[PDB]
RNA sequence: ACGGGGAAUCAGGGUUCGAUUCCGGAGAGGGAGCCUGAGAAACGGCUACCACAUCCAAGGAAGGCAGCAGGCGCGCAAAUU
RNA sequence: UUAAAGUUGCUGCAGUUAAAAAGCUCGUAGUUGGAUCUCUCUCGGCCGAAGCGUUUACUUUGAAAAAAUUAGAGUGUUCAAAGCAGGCCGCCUGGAUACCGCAGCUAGGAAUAAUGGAAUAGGACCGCGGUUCUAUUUUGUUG
RNA sequence: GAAGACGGUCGAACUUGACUAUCUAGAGGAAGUAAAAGUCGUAACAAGGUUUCCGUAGGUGAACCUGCGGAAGGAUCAUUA
């Protein structure tokens, strides 16, 4: 049972803040060891420079080749594999290009089919991928 | 439920409702006090004097006849011990466990049974130091206890 | 900071000046004078905001610089001179005379007064000390020091000052049964008879006051200004008589006073 | 000589103790008049303050301190210094979330005058606020009531 | 050990309205039990009861009507200001129409409807409906 | 992590944010020392040292935008010399 | 980041088998603890001072708590978000009010909960005597 | 009454040690990670072909095996005067 006195608030307030630490949603946002491990550092987006186009394989029950891009981030030098989303969207990218990268949507976890990929390309060469895919703009060289 | 035992046992005395000294008792309160002085000069505890008057002299409760209980009679006449009755019987019991223990070192039963008699002594010495029946520096030391009893 | 502040922000102004939000960043910042800056009404707010004589804070300069304004019978050419409680403002070019008295809602009021009354004001005695070859002094709440006072003037009483000469004419003492105005707190501007004064030595005296309708209230002793001996005020009173209406009957007064129209 | 243990001369500084006397003054009595004063909040000056020979410049009955501010209380814990003791105040702090309290305590070093002699630890004492007397001491002992386990 | 005699004397009379009995024995009685029981009786929840006087601490025999749904104790006896009584009688009572919270004010052990009239706060003792 | 007044969400309880226009603190590249004055350990004052850096005829001279604009750099990220 | 999350649980979770009760016992701090007990003395004009009683927690009232924000009153910004303005044919207005935890002041209550009060009576209330210090009036002023 | 000196004090800073901490060039090997549908038995789930599981010691190609002591989460809630 729980303690239930009237002078027991120090037992109550301090049992909770030790028991709060077994909460993995609490710990991953308060310990600080998973924000120095995050490649962004707690930003929504980041920019980088494309090293190469590595295309990685889908997971078990369904087969395709997810076309990704190996990015090296500007602000801390870290490296990142980001997913180039729609079809024919690797054909707007060459090597050594500057790419704004987002998260995939699961807040630092992989999104189902793709293994170990937590980011997706947003803009290439300071123009948007939705502007290139839908033909609204032209790829600047 | 008993303190240092797992037994939850129910056995005690049941005092009656009628609080008065009964009809047949032909002893006044002064005669009962005079009996108590002799039975204490014989060297009996307050827990033994109340038994002898109940069995032989027909006194049900001395608190009901005299108006006062046993220990406040002896401590007002002066014939009372310094350390109280139940603290004596624990100290005297912890001597005989400790005295027997130097003969038989391997007895790990009475080594455990000594600590229960030990831990009951400090529960009572604390209470008597609080109610100031003992002086506030009395401590049970395991070596001097042969000369306390 | 390093040394004293010279500006006042507008939101940080006293609430009773009733300056709106959107006219500027700064508020008029009263000059040092007889009154605390939380307990005063600057002369720029009395001319521009209350009386609507001026329209900008340059016309108050143009009015005061013609020496048209006397505050307690001395001509004042500072527009941020702190006028406070019981101060007489004589404008002689138009012919009006005002006295700054609180009204029932914790603000000041435009209280026009007769020039037969404008020759005197009341002050409250704040500290009495001897000195300088044994000569006794007063200090009032206007910092007016009046040496050689009457020996029956003590602390927390009320004198009556003649404003052309500076001398005391007659006084009221602190007693029960005297008519008092509250000059601070949440009962500010309220007029009632002193019922009781509870002493708390090493702390503040509490002075229970009784209305003319029966509404009792209390204050600390420093928010107490003895106005009259008995029940007769030695100054005039505003349109409301220092008697605070609760908001229900304050509504009833409006919704019954609009029905006199046509 | 029972006062002058220091390296300078302990002297109550308001009292002049070198008045010239006549033959009925030297043969009559060597009388040192003492300075005492009344703390104004209903604390009785002890007879030791009016009959003593101690000299203390921070005693609230015979020295140069005036008691003004908060008047508080606490129980004595450690009397191991020269003229000053350690009292602990006990209080309950309300935690709002849990609607419960918690035991709390704070210590005060506080000046004990020599008029309050025979003070044992563990009894309630009224303290009174004055100016800083040392780095940590700002209260002065005003009256000492004894713990209920006395007689 | 028996901390809270009013707690064991209400779950004795809670557990017997379940089992359908017409009388409870509740030993031992304090006088906070007799004040609490008299408030339930005055609102028709309980009926007549008898205090058996042995010299130790009394027992009570309470005749039960079949009208009590729940009888409860609050532990610890939290302090309840009158501006915070609405939250308590919304957490503890089934509706705005019936049921009472018993609190011990300085004007006596009373309901929450009595304590609102006499304008009093207190410490919450328990509830019944 | 500058603190408060406060802000978001919310049945009741709560949780999280509060650099940011009001009050209070601190600081003018980093430490340190002063002059004047009612008030400064002041930087749109001075004197040093450490760090940068402008002119120079090479002997010297002058610096301090976390004021308003504006520039570079940084960055996902912010306006008119 | 907040709700959803009664998936951090004070309200309000769980612990045989789903994650989980320490091998057992003693033990200091902490936390929690059984019944019980129905305002007066020296003064001023019967009404105020002064004292309390053992000390508190609790509860209710009071006074003190910056403005802006929040709630909320009044007001046809052309509606509204706002604003503190406006209205009538020189006058008549308004610029309210609530909320402002804990700690600290104040006054009433006395249930609950802590705590004292005499047990080798150096105990209460009475009038009786002694010892030591000593007030300042008394002897037309004066030592 | 200027320069300048003795001494005091405040104290930036410099030099060399120790303790560290961080930015930086380098063979060697190290561990886990991305898969693997690659080869030998078949430890386990049926009495899973030596019931299984737990602690603890020893030996191996390895799932493991064996000595001691438990438990049933067993394959018996039971075995006759």
Curated annotation (Swiss-Prot), chain A:
Subcellular location: Cytoplasm, Cytosol; Cytoplasm; Rough endoplasmic reticulum; Nucleus, Nucleolus
Residue(s) carrying 3-hydroxyproline: 61
Pfam families: Ribosom_S12_S23
Repressor in keyword set: no
A molecular function (GO) term: structural constituent of ribosome
Residue ranges with Basic residues bias: 1-19
Main location: cytoplasm
Region annotation (Disordered) ranges: 1-25
Keywords, ordered alphabetically: Acetylation, Cytoplasm, Deafness, Disease variant, Dwarfism, Endoplasmic reticulum, Hydroxylation, Isopeptide bond, Nucleus, Ribonucleoprotein, Ribosomal protein, Ubl conjugation
Superkingdom of source: Eukaryota
Chain positions found as N6-succinyllysine: 53
InterPro entries cross-referenced by the UniProt entry: NA-bd_OB-fold (IPR012340), Ribosomal_uS12 (IPR006032), Ribosomal_uS12_euk/arc (IPR005680)
Subunit details: Component of the 40S small ribosomal subunit. Part of the small subunit (SSU) processome, composed of more than 70 proteins and the RNA chaperone small nucleolar RNA (snoRNA) U3.
Protein name: Small ribosomal subunit protein uS12
From Swiss-Prot, chain C:
Modified residues (N6-acetyllysine): 232
GO cellular component, one term: cytoplasmic ribonucleoprotein granule
S4 RNA-binding domain segment(s): 41-103
CDD domains named among the record's database cross-references: KOW_RPS4, S4
Keyword RNA-binding tagged: yes
Main subcellular location: cytoplasm
PANTHER family for this protein: 30S/40S RIBOSOMAL PROTEIN S4, SMALL RIBOSOMAL SUBUNIT PROTEIN ES4
Protein's name in the database: Small ribosomal subunit protein eS4, X isoform
Provenance organism: Homo sapiens
Lineage: Eukaryota, Metazoa, Chordata, Craniata, Vertebrata
UniProtKB/Swiss-Prot annotation, chain D:
Family of this protein: Belongs to the universal ribosomal protein uS17 family.
Protein keywords: Acetylation, Citrullination, Cytoplasm, Lipoprotein, Methylation, Nucleus, Palmitate, Phosphoprotein, Ribonucleoprotein, Ribosomal protein, RNA-binding, rRNA-binding
Reported modifications of this chain: Citrullinated by PADI4.
Positions of post-translational Citrulline modification: 21
Entry's Gene Ontology BP terms: cytoplasmic translation; ribosomal small subunit biogenesis; translation
Positions of S-palmitoyl cysteine lipidation: 59
Membrane-traversing stretches: none
Modified residues (N6-acetyllysine): 37, 44, 57
GO terms, molecular function: RNA binding; rRNA binding; structural constituent of ribosome
Organism lineage: Eukaryota, Metazoa, Chordata, Craniata, Vertebrata
Residue numbers bearing the Phosphoserine modification: 66, 109
Predominant place of localization: cytoplasm
PANTHER family: 40S RIBOSOMAL PROTEIN S11 FAMILY MEMBER, SMALL RIBOSOMAL SUBUNIT PROTEIN US17
InterPro entries the UniProt entry points to: NA-bd_OB-fold, Ribosomal_uS17, Ribosomal_uS17_arc/euk, Ribosomal_uS17_CS, Ribosomal_uS17_N
Effect seen on changing residue 59 to S: Abolishes S-acylation
Modified residues (Omega-N-methylarginine): 68
Tagged with keyword rRNA-binding: yes
Record's subcellular location: Cytoplasm; Nucleus, Nucleolus
Subunit architecture: Component of the small ribosomal subunit. Part of the small subunit (SSU) processome, composed of more than 70 proteins and the RNA chaperone small nucleolar RNA (snoRNA) U3.
Pfam families, per the entry: Ribosomal_S17, Ribosomal_S17_N
Residue positions where N-acetylalanine is found in the record: 1
GO cellular component, one term: extracellular exosome
Name the record gives this protein: Small ribosomal subunit protein uS17
From Swiss-Prot, chain E:
N6-succinyllysine: modified positions: 87
Keywords of this entry: Cytoplasm, Diamond-Blackfan anemia, Nucleus, Ribonucleoprotein, Ribosomal protein
GO cellular component, one term: nucleoplasm
GO molecular function: RNA binding; structural constituent of ribosome
InterPro entries, per database record: Ribosomal_uS8, Ribosomal_uS8_CS, Ribosomal_uS8_sf
Primary subcellular site in the record, as a coarse category: cytoplasm
Pfam families the record matches: Ribosomal_S8
GO biological process: cytoplasmic translation; positive regulation of cell cycle; positive regulation of cell population proliferation; response to virus; ribosomal small subunit biogenesis; translation
Superkingdom of origin organism: Eukaryota
Protein's cellular compartments: Cytoplasm; Nucleus, Nucleolus
Gene3D superfamilies to which the protein is assigned, alphabetical: 3.30.1370.30, 3.30.1490.10
Cytoplasm is among the record's keywords: yes
Family membership noted in the UniProt record: Belongs to the universal ribosomal protein uS8 family.
Quaternary structure note: Component of the 40S ribosomal subunit. Part of the small subunit (SSU) processome, composed of more than 70 proteins and the RNA chaperone small nucleolar RNA (snoRNA) U3.
Disease tied to this protein: Diamond-Blackfan anemia 20: A form of Diamond-Blackfan anemia, a congenital non-regenerative hypoplastic anemia that usually presents early in infancy. Diamond-Blackfan anemia is characterized by a moderate to severe macrocytic anemia, erythroblastopenia, and an increased risk of malignancy. 30 to 40% of Diamond-Blackfan anemia patients present with short stature and congenital anomalies, the most frequent being craniofacial (Pierre-Robin syndrome and cleft palate), thumb and urogenital anomalies. DBA20 inheritance is autosomal dominant.
């Amino acid at each position: 049972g729980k303690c239930r006195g009237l002078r027991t608030a120090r037992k109550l307030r301090s049992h909770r803040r030790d028991q709060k630490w077994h909460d993995k949603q609490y710990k991953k946002a308060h310990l600080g060891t998973a924000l120095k491990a995050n490649p962004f550092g707690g930003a929504s987006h980041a920019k980088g420079i494309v090293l190469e186009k590595v295309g990685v394989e889908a997971k078990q029950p369904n087969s395709a080749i997810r076309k990704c891009v190996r990015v090296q981030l500007i602000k801390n030098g870290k490296k990142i594999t980001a997913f180039v989303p729609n079809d024919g969207c690797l054909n707007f990218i060459e090597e050594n290009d500057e790419v704004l990268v987002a998260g995939f949507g699961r807040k630092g976890h992989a999104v189902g089919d793709i293994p170990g990929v937590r980011f997706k390309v947003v803009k290439v060469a300071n123009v948007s991928l939705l502007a290139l895919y839908k033909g609204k703009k032209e790829r600047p060289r | 439920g008993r303190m240092h035992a797992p037994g939850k046992g129910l056995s005690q005395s049941a005092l009656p409702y009628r609080r008065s000294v009964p009809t047949w008792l032909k002893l006044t309160s002064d005669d009962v006090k005079e009996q108590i002085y002799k039975l204490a000069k014989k060297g009996l505890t307050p827990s033994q004097i109340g038994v002898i008057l109940r069995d032989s002299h027909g006194v049900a409760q001395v608190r009901f006849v005299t108006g006062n209980k046993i220990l406040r009679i002896l401590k007002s006449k002066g014939l009372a011990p310094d350390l109280p009755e139940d603290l004596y019987h624990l100290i005297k019991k912890a001597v005989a466990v400790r005295k027997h223990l130097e003969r038989n070192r391997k007895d790990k039963d009475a080594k455990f049974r000594l600590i229960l008699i030990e831990s009951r002594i400090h529960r009572l010495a604390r209470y008597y130091k609080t109610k100031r029946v003992l002086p506030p520096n009395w401590k049970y030391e395991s070596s001097t206890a042969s000369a306390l009893v | 900071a390093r040394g004293p502040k010279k500006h006042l922000k507008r939101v940080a102004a006293p609430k009773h000046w009733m300056l709106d939000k959107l006219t500027g960043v700064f508020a008029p910042r009263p000059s040092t004078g007889p009154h605390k800056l939380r307990e005063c009404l600057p002369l720029i707010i009395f001319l521009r905001n209350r009386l609507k004589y001026a329209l900008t804070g340059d016309e108050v300069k143009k009015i005061c610089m013609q020496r048209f304004i006397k505050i307690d019978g001395k001509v004042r050419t500072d527009i941020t001179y702190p006028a406070g409680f019981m101060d007489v403002i004589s404008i002689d070019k138009t012919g009006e005379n005002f006295r700054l008295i609180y009204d029932t809602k914790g603000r000041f009021a435009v209280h026009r007064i007769t020039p037969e009354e404008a020759k005197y004001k009341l002050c409250k005695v704040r500290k009495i000390f001897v000195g300088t070859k044994g000569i006794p002094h007063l200090v009032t709440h206007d910092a007016r020091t009046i040496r050689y006072p009457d020996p029956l003037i003590k602390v927390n009483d009320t004198i009556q000052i003649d404003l052309e000469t500076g001398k005391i004419t007659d006084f009221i003492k602190f007693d029960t049964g005297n008519l008092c105005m509250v000059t601070g707190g949440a009962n500010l501007g309220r007029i009632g008879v002193i019922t009781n004064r509870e002493r708390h030595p090493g702390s503040f005296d509490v002075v229970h006051v009784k209305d003319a309708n029966g509404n009792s209230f209390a204050t600390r002793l420093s928010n107490i200004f003895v106005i009259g001996k008995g029940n007769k005020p030695w100054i005039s009173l505003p349109r409301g008589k220092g008697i605070r209406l609760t908001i229900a009957e304050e509504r009833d007064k409006r919704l019954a006073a609009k029905q006199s129209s046509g | 000589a029972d006062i002058q243990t220091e390296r300078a001369y302990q002297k109550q500084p308001t009292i002049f103790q070198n008045k010239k006397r006549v033959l009925l003054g030297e043969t009559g009595k060597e009388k040192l008049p003492r300075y005492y004063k009344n703390i104004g909040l209903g604390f009785k000056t002890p007879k030791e303050a009016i009959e003593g020979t101690y000299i203390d410049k921070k005693c609230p009955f015979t020295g140069n301190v005036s008691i003004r501010g908060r008047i508080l209380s606490g129980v004595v814990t450690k009397m191991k210094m020269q003229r000053t003791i350690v009292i602990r105040r006990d209080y309950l702090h309300y935690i709002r979330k849990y609607n419960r309290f918690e035991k709390r305590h704070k210590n005060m070093s506080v000046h004990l005058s020599p008029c309050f002699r025979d003070v044992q630890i563990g009894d309630i004492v009224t303290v009174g606020e004055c100016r800083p007397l040392s780095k940590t001491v700002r209260f002065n002992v005003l009256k000492v009531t004894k713990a209920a386990g006395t007689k | 050990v028996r901390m809270n005699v009013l707690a064991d004397a209400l779950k004795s009379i809670n557990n017997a309205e379940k089992r359908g009995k017409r009388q409870v024995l509740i030993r031992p009685c304090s006088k906070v039990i007799v004040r609490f029981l008299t408030v339930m009786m005055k609102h028709g929840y309980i009926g007549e009861f008898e205090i058996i006087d042995d010299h130790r601490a009394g027992k009570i025999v309470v005749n039960l009507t079949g009208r009590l749904n729940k009888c409860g104790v609050i532990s610890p006896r939290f302090d309840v200001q009158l501006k915070d009584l609405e939250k308590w009688q919304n957490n503890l009572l089934p509706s705005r129409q019936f049921g009472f919270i018993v609190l011990t004010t300085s004007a006596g052990i009373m309901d929450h409807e009595e304590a609102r009239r006499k304008h009093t706060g207190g410490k919450i003792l328990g509830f019944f409906f």
